Swiss-Prot record:
Function text: Catalyzes the hydrolysis of complex carboxylic polyesters found in the cell wall of plants. Degrades cutin, a macromolecule that forms the structure of the plant cuticle. Allows pathogenic fungi to penetrate through the cuticular barrier into the host plant during the initial stage of fungal infection.
Keywords, ordered alphabetically: Disulfide bond, Glycoprotein, Hydrolase, Secreted, Serine esterase, Signal, Virulence
Name of the protein: Cutinase 1
SUPFAM superfamilies tied to this protein: alpha/beta-Hydrolases
Localization in the cell: Secreted
Superkingdom as given in the UniProt entry: Eukaryota
Outcome of mutating residue 68 to A: Increases activity on poly(ethylene terephthalate) (PET) and decreases activity on polyamide 6,6
Organism: Fusarium vanettenii (Neocosmospora pisi)
EC number: 3.1.1.74
Disulfide bonds: 15-93, 155-162
Length: 197
């Protein structure tokens, strides 16, 4: 339901052509949360069940509230977790195109992990989508070390976390529409431009 593990248990002899690594937000259940499943259903329709592997960031990432106050908007531990998954994907399936996404704290996590990622693997990521990015102001609407034409941030009007504060108002919980449509569509568009399809 809110937990998908296709990379971790993924059989190398049956590699997906695409792999989606996603990070939930504070307090959210499973390793996908409330938005994760929405994007996934879309990826499976465009590519097929056998076409994509959906992987959430669980393990050591335990979307804690207090960790929003840490230097990089997340824990040192969580960053290694997500970083670890990228390396694993590149290992089991070196020909698979990679894509990623994150929400609130997971948005911060995605930014930090891809920033610390080995450049050769980082080039494999066709696209990344971020919702209610907590480090938007600070990181100037971008992901450190990642290209503009591959990044897509969603920051509703009124959401102060995008402005640079940690005040959580109502707009922060309104990314459902985005996740059901513009998010997966941008990712799918990205996968086909870099491969052929």
């Amino acid at each position: 339901r809110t937990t998908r593990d296709d990379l971790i248990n993924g059989n190398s002899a049956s590699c997906a052509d695409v792999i989606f690594i996603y990070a939930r937000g504070s307090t959210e259940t499973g390793n996908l949360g409330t938005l994760g499943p929405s994007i996934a259903s879309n990826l499976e329709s465009a590519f097929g069940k056998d076409g994509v592997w959906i992987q959430g960031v669980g393990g050591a990432y335990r979307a804690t509230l207090a960790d929003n106050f840490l230097p990089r908007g997340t824990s040192s531990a969580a960053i290694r977790e997500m970083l670890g998954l990228f390396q694993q994907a590149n290992t089991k399936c070196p020909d698979a195109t990679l894509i990623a996404g994150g929400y609130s704290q997971g948005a911060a996590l995605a930014a930090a992990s891809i920033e610390d990622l080995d450049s050769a693997i980082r080039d494999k990521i066709a696209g990344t989508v971020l919702f209610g990015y907590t480090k938007n102001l600070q990181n100037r609407g971008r992901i450190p070390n990642y290209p503009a034409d591959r990044t897509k941030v969603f920051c509703n009007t009124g959401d102060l976390v995008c402005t640079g504060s940690l005040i959580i108002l109502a707009p922060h919980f309104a990314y459902g529409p985005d996740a059901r449509g513009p998010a997966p569509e941008f990712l799918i568009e990205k996968v086909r431009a870099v491969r052929g399809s």
